[PDB]
Design a protein around this ligand. Structure first.
Ligand SMILES: NCCCCCC(=O)N[C@H]1Cc2ccccc2[C@H]1Cc1ccc2c(c1C(=O)O)OC[C@@H](CCC(=O)O)O2
Ligand SMILES: NCCCCCC(=O)N[C@H]1Cc2ccccc2[C@H]1Cc1ccc2c(c1C(=O)O)OC[C@@H](CCC(=O)O)O2
Lengths: 149, 149
């Protein structure tokens, strides 16, 4: 499970925020895109997998699961593409809660940034640094280090 | 040491590739930008620091060192902005060598991607995964995990 990530797409201000959540730690990366297309999702996953050891991705929907561009990116980067069906129903509620939390943080910083993309990265920062007693950034690094060793 | 990163800006195909190198591991993140401005550099550093524990940045030039936008980003994210002066003369050559390596990798994948930004992210992937023996991705996770404990 050190290699398992979940895709999550949420909306704000008429734009799309694409999130990848590292399931075991809660650590995230995110970007604003105009629209969630296979092309956008493929490029985002390429970025993600060059930065962390992404073994499995639970895709956020069936259009991205089906996407030949998304499949090509996953093949390229050595990612196993899986569906994101919450056979465990606590998974959907946990995502919903992170979307609400992220949008809350975005509102708290929104004033400090001219552009939504900036506020979203501020939100990624605050989320990954938040101590809950460790932070998500601390958990992911410890999970993967344990796994390497 | 686990917190120190170096900025590096190189050029290809009439575009700019902005790189952040984690000094102790050689691990990188990179983006293509039309032009290196304070605004682009600020946004890049914000993203970086939300994803890894960035304590110190050796800026790549004096325009970014001076940039009020870059200083505002560094203040926001808790980054100490330093000059990138190679008091150790082996800095210039190690950076020059990675720029050469990255451009070589970009050439090897260039045909698999319609867009330069895609080839650059493929290059980040290959660079961070390359076993040299450990990879850069493995070293950075071990360095920071050791530091947390
Ligand atoms: N020269 C022949 C190319 C044949 C392409 C056919 C094909 O499936 N290639 C894949 C191989 C491959 C390998 C890894 C990742 C992606 C890809 C795919 C390519 C691709 C996907 C998304 C992109 C791309 C490009 C690109 O093509 O660079 O570009 C910018 C980026 C911006 C986000 C946005 O703007 O949506 O999204
Ligand atoms: N009402 C708020 C006024 C704030 C302006 C004054 C000011 O210094 N703010 C900083 C506070 C702060 C805090 C953290 C990071 C950046 C910033 C700065 C803002 C900023 C910088 C670069 C950007 C931005 C914006 C933005 O303003 O969002 O936008 C998108 C991004 C795209 C890359 C490109 O396109 O170059 O680059």
């Amino acid at each position: 499970s050190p290699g398992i990530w979940q895709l999550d797409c949420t909306h704000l201000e008429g734009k799309v925020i694409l999130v990848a959540v590292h399931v075991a730690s809660g650590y995230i990366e995110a970007e604003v895109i105009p629209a969630e297309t296979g092309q956008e999702t493929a490029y985002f996953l390429l970025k993600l997998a060059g930065r962390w050891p992404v073994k499995t991705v639970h895709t956020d929907n069936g259009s991205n699961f089906t996407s030949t561009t998304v499949k090509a990116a996953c093949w390229w980067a050595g990612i196993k593409q899986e569906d994101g069906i919450p056979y465990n129903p606590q998974s959907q509620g946990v995502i919903e809660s992170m979307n609400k939390e992220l949008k809350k943080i975005i509102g708290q910083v929104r004033d400090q940034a001219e552009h939504l993309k900036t506020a979203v990265q501020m939100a990624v920062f605050i989320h990954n640094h938040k101590r809950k007693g460790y932070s998500a950034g601390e958990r992911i690094v410890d999970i993967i280090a344990t796994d390497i060793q």
